[PDB]
């Protein structure tokens with residue numbers, strides 16, 4: 332695991348890509364936010380598939396293996412067009428698990444490149460109500476139906492990212508503890524968006540144990556509280572993060588940065604507040 | 620710099636993206652190569668612009684600042700469609716240097732996305748002899764002419780990646796020392812492709828000082844082996860960022876043992892195998908490096924227990 336590791340990445344040898352997961356830098360965005368207070372963020376784009384999903388992917392596979400639910404060399408299946416696919420693909424490659432992915436033909440082919448490159452068997456499922464570039468709820472229901480049919484036929488382990496509790500456990504045992512150590516306990520708030528919610532629930536649960544006075548915010552597009560963010564704000568702060576800090580990240584990172592700056596300006600926090608967010612993935616994982 | 624750093628990235632705070640450069644993991648590819656001997660590789664794709672060019676970019680900017688040649692807040696310009704552009708873009712963003720890039724309209728628009736996202740001012744220059752998707756030497760010469768014209772007006776610092784000796788210095792002072800420490804001195808051979816030649820010349824020079832018995836190999840595309848002295852029959856290959864038809868101007872034959880040739884088909888095969896066996900999606904030059912290192916392990920030219928070290932140059936996502 333990333334918790335018990337004796338691995339020295341700086342001055343030693345890294346046994347495998349699994350040891351590249353977690354213990355990510357916590358960077359100061361001191362140029363983007365020169366004060367008062369400090370904006371810091373976990374560089375989750377420096378995980379081996381360039382997203383925070385390496386953590387949840389690693390936990391969900393590793394814990395299925397430990398439980399006996401997933402046997403050596405046996406098949407894994409997930410429904411995804413996103414970062415979770417790349418993460419599971421990387422973990423299953425190292426651990427020697429055949430991995431099948433279902434996703435809608437609706438997705439840009441670009442969404443399968445990394446998964447396929449890391450040895451995923453990518454099944455493209457016909458759209459039911461959507462058109463190229465628009466994957467609908469019925470398009471997703473169909474991808475799900477294809478994966479369930481394959482799972483019943485093969486008895487592959489279904490990762491079930493949205494309902495697997497080892498998703499949040501990853502962040503409770505790695506992300507949160509790392510932030511607590513890296514800040515030496517100096518942190519007034521944490522904030523991140525929710526897809527599965529693993530990152531927010533796991534990290535916030537751990538931080539509130541160390542210090543219940545830490546304000547944890549969900550970033551909501553268009554638990555202490557929520558901060559709302561527009562697509563225009565996401566785009567603006569994605570660009571500013573690049574221009575000021577030299578980090579090309581995705582749109583959810585734009586949103587997190589824009590929410591964190593609103594939170595620093597609000598006066599809800601002490602004048603000298605240290606605010607921590609997540610740089611979720613690389614900007615390279617997006618077309619155009 | 621990356622040499623004097625007290626920064627603790629694991630258990631402390633990373634001041635800026637500059638401190639994300641170098642001290643990259645040296646990974647054991649023990650599944651791709653289960654023995655005998657060992658394949659090791661620097662994860663240069665975990666630099667902040669996902670290429671080894673963060674090192675050479677950082678050195679060329681930092682050393683121009685130290686020399687006085689580049690003043691605070693003054694302009695930088697480079698002719699580039701490549702990983703070097705992203706690296707300079709990242710370094711100049713942190714240090715607050717306006718950065719202008721020239722490149723041929725011939726290049727895919729995709730080649731400008733990262734540079735532009737990190738605040739690079741991208742000037743697209745009309746092709747002279749090439750067509751969309753085919754950038755010729757005359758197309759590149761034109762981009763150069765546009766950058767020199769702009770440089771006359773603005774007096775920007777010209778990075779000059781193919782002629783800047785601080786390119787090699789980067790790898791002499793970081794890459795080589797890291798490999799030497801991370802292996803605790805156990806390395807029988809080093810190998811990497813050559814574009815500018817910084818990585819090979821710098822790393823090899825340092826390793827041969829620690830141990831002159833370390834064999835250092837250049838990875839060359841089949842039919843494009845200038846450094847080996849062989850005639851060029853195939854100018855076009857898939858090893859993007861390396862395998863230029865000329866012996867690089869920064870090349871130093873005194874840290875060179877031999878060349879290992881690789882086909883396009885081998886680059887592709889080992890790019891895929893690196894992904895399927897190790898979970899690392901890297902670029903074409905990484906495919907080539909892995910295929911040359913495996914060929915070198917299988918050859919029997921080295922001891923059966925040999926430790927061979929190469930470079931995972933960039934992410935597969937940059938293509």
Ligand SMILES: *Cc1c(COP(=O)(O)O)cnc(C)c1O
Nearest residue numbers: 414525526527528529530583611
């Ligand atoms: C998964 C993901 C999120 C949200 O993470 P969860 O832990 O699933 O809530 C945010 N941004 C990106 C880019 C993601 O891939």
Ligand SMILES: *Cc1c(COP(=O)(O)O)cnc(C)c1O
Nearest residue numbers: 702814815816817818860904932
């Ligand atoms: C630049 C580059 C090389 C060559 O390294 P040099 O130090 O320029 O010789 C190899 N691979 C990739 C992907 C590069 O970008």
